[PDB]
Amino acid sequence: ATPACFTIGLGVGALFXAKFC
């Protein structure tokens, strides 16, 4: 879901977890 599929909880892992963590 492009930006709509950012993820309120996990989204961080996919988004923030993608470069970080």
Instruction: Provide the 8-state DSSP code for 4.
Output: G
Amino acid identity of residue 9, one-letter, is: G
Rounded distance between C-alpha atoms, residue 2 and residue 21, angstroms: 21
In sequence order, which ranges of the chain are alpha helices (DSSP H)? Answer: 11-19
- What amino acid occupies position 2? T
Experimental method: NMR
Q: For the chain, how many helices (H) and strands (E)?
A: 1, 0
Residues in the chain: 21
Contacts of 11 (CB under 8 A, 6+ apart): 5
Rounded Cα distance, 16 and 10, in Å? 9
Residue type, 3: P
Count of CB atoms within 10 A of residue 11's CB? 14
